[PDB]
Write a protein that binds this ligand. Structure first.
Ligand SMILES: O=C1CC=CN1c1ccccc1-c1ccc(F)cc1
Length: 186
């Protein structure tokens, strides 16, 4: 099936806990895959203008590991619950992708999660200004604007609202699209 095929592809790229004990400042992100209208989508947040890190930016759900977290996947799931109301029973963590090194002392670990079809986001306005889906296939043929660095513009056909996706967030979205969608019969 579509979902079984996605998880099987993703598992081939799982690094697991190989980099997880290294002594960095540690953050995790959740890359949430949602099946709608017979296609896979990624779920994105727009961060509230209030925040420390990256006010008003498009980001995946995530944040800093705390002492309660059993592991880096727990961090991603805790933060996703706080931001959008995603509960544990509503997500299956499929794999851990290549981590992202930043600022010489920080390591951000991304986890891909399959999201239950009955989940409905409840944006927490202290954390997130907006939540939106993008079809995964978009990232194979994005609308690119050079700002010199590349920026994706996605317009939601439901309402005509345009979002800018950039940086680590854009990079990870492309990676997931390649992993899941490359070399598929029509
Ligand atoms: O500012 C950005 C842009 C993308 C990753 N960062 C970071 C830069 C440094 C430390 C942490 C983050 C981070 C931000 C949001 C999040 F959900 C998880 C990690």
């Amino acid at each position: 099936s579509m979902l079984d095929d996605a998880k099987a592809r993703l598992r081939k790229y799982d690094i697991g806990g190989k980099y997880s004990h290294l002594p960095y400042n540690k953050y995790s992100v959740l890359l949430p895959l949602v099946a709608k209208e017979g296609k896979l989508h990624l779920l994105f947040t727009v961060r509230s203008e209030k925040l420390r890190r990256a006010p008003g930016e498009v980001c995946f759900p995530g944040g800093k590991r705390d002492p309660t977290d059993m592991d880096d996947a727990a961090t991603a799931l805790r933060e996703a619950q706080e931001e959008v109301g995603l509960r544990p029973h509503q997500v299956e963590v499929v794999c851990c992708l290549v981590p992202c090194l930043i600022d010489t002392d920080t390591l951000i670990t991304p986890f891909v999660g399959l999201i239950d079809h009955n989940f409905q986001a409840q944006p927490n306005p202290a954390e997130v200004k907006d939540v939106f889906l993008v079809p995964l296939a978009y990232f194979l043929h994005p609308q690119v604007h050079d700002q010199i660095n590349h920026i994706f513009e996605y317009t939601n056909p439901e309402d005509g609202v345009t979002y800018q996706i950039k940086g680590m967030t854009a990079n990870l979205a492309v990676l997931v699209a390649f992993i899941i969608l490359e070399k598929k019969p029509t």
